[PDB]
């Protein structure tokens, strides 16, 4: 019965693996989608660097 | 019973992997085609302020 | 020279979004490879335990 607690762990880990492969792959792709979001949020910050720059300089070209 | 299991579940797993390849290619193509949208659909309507 | 510097600014902005989307597609393949690789490590372990 101390051994059956190990056979139950080996039987439950096989059942677990059927959600665990999806949980791993979903949490991989949700990290990877946050990672493609964070590179694309730094692209929104580059396009904000151009927006604060054209706000500062191109407005003073119109003053020019 | 269990010999009917081995021969039934595996010809189904052959037909299922003949579809899992299509669902991996569409999910791969989602990630890419959305990275294409992330540039192209920003540019599209942004450049319609400038079309005016 | 300001109009040329404004046309090259559109070429910069378009080509930035195009290569940011191709980079975001390569990171999307990297992430799909991980979610297949997490299945392959689990399928190898389940197979070896089932045999033993």
């Amino acid at each position: 019965e101390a051994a059956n607690r190990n056979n139950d762990a080996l039987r439950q880990a096989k059942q677990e693996s059927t959600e665990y492969r999806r949980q791993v792959q979903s949490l991989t792709c949700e990290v990877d989608a946050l990672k493609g979001t964070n590179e694309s949020l730094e692209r929104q910050m580059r396009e904000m660097e151009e927006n604060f720059a054209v706000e500062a300089a191109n407005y003073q070209d119109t003053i020019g | 019973l269990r010999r009917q299991v081995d021969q039934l579940t595996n010809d189904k797993a052959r037909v299922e992997v003949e579809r899992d390849n299509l669902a991996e290619d569409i999910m791969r193509l989602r990630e890419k085609l959305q990275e294409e949208m992330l540039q192209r659909e920003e540019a599209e309507n942004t450049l319609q302020s400038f079309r005016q | 020279a300001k109009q040329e510097s404004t046309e090259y600014r559109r070429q910069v902005q378009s080509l930035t979004c195009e290569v940011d989307a191709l980079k975001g597609t390569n990171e999307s393949l990297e992430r799909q490879m991980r979610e297949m690789e997490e299945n392959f490590a689990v399928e190898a372990a389940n197979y070896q335990d089932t045999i033993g």
């Binding site: 693996s17 | 269990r2 299991v5 579940t9 595996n10 299922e16 | 089932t50």
Partner: peptide, 16 residues
């Protein structure tokens, strides 16, 4: 992987 697991269950059932 329900099939790959089920073929492994039948080798366990053969023991059972």
């Amino acid at each position: 992987d329900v099939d790959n697991a089920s073929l492994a269950r039948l080798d366990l059932e053969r023991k059972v």
